[PDB]
Amino acid sequence: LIGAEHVNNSYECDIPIGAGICASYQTSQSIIAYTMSL
Amino acid sequence: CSNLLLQYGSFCTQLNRALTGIAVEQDKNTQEVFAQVKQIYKTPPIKDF
Numbered sequence A: 001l002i003g004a005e006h007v008n009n010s011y012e013c014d015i016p017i018g019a020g021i022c023a024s025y026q027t028s029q030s031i032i033a034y035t036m037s038l
Numbered sequence B: 001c002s003n004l005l006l007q008y009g010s011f012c013t014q015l016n017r018a019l020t021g022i023a024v025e026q027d028k029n030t031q032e033v034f035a036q037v038k039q040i041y042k043t044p045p046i047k048d049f
């Protein structure tokens, strides 16, 4: 994955990717990738 | 081989769309079974039931 910065915290994801990690647009504001919160 | 594949690229599009639909269907299938609740309940430390 390129263009998305990984962050250790977890929120509820909206755009699925696979293997338990999604991507989302969150605070400027940029696209981030994080593990899903069940 | 690719120069003759533009006459069946429509068929290839149908196959790719069917496989993508199958994949997203299988991804959705797990959500309708195990994700019944949206709150994760922790087991109590007391095991006296």
Ligand SMILES: *[C@@H]1O[C@H](CO)[C@@H](O)[C@H](O)[C@H]1NC(C)=O
Residues within 6 Å of the ligand: A006, A007, A008, A009
């Ligand atoms: C997230 O926090 C954990 C807490 O120990 C740390 O180990 C990890 O390096 C952090 N990740 C980032 C990307 O800051």
